[PDB]
């Protein structure tokens, strides 16, 4: 592992960040002082959920809660393939992270994000309560249930 960390090959270190993510070694990746890994995540954060989650962990441990709430909220409003329940977790985290002070950011900007995440989380829970009840309902034909699961187990719908 010395030979690994003693390298200056950049495509290599990118390939190793991806490999650590694959194997699940949050142990060793979260323990890198470097910003090089943060910058690498900032480009692909809004591309994949698993990468965004890593980026948000780096922000939170650095008391940058508002920036994580921003990543999580945009990810919940996006058209990436994300389940409704995963979008409930993202909003719930963003709601908490925007409710606490982050230095350098105005109280107004925090509250406006904590409010957008609170409303979207309220709608998401309604949608989850619906989807669950509809799937379990004995009086609903199977043919329709599959159709319900397609349109409700994804991005959050209007009221």
């Amino acid at each position: 592992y010395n030979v690994v960390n003693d390298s200056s090959d950049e495509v290599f270190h990118f390939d190793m960040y991806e490999w650590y993510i694959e194997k699940g070694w949050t142990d060793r990746i979260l323990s890198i002082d470097s910003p090089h890994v943060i910058t690498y995540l900032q480009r692909l954060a809004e591309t994949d959920f698993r990468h965004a989650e890593l980026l948000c962990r780096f922000y939170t441990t650095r008391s940058r809660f508002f920036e994580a709430a921003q990543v999580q909220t945009n990810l919940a409003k996006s058209d990436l393939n994300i389940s409704l329940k995963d979008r409930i977790i993202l909003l719930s985290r963003a709601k908490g992270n925007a409710s606490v002070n982050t230095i350098g950011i105005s109280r107004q900007q925090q509250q406006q994000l904590n409010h957008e995440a609170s409303e979207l989380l309220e709608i998401a829970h309604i949608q989850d309560d619906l989807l669950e009840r509809l799937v379990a309902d004995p009086r609903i034909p199977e043919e329709r249930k599959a159709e319900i699961e397609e349109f409700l187990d994804g991005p959050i719908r209007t009221l």
Binding site: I140, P141, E143, R144, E147, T158, L159
Partner: peptide
């Protein structure tokens, strides 16, 4: 923003196509 429209929906109790 909510807008009720009972007019044209999709029969929740009938399959598609």
């Amino acid at each position: 923003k909510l807008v009720i429209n009972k007019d044209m929906r999709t029969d929740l109790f009938s399959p598609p196509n």
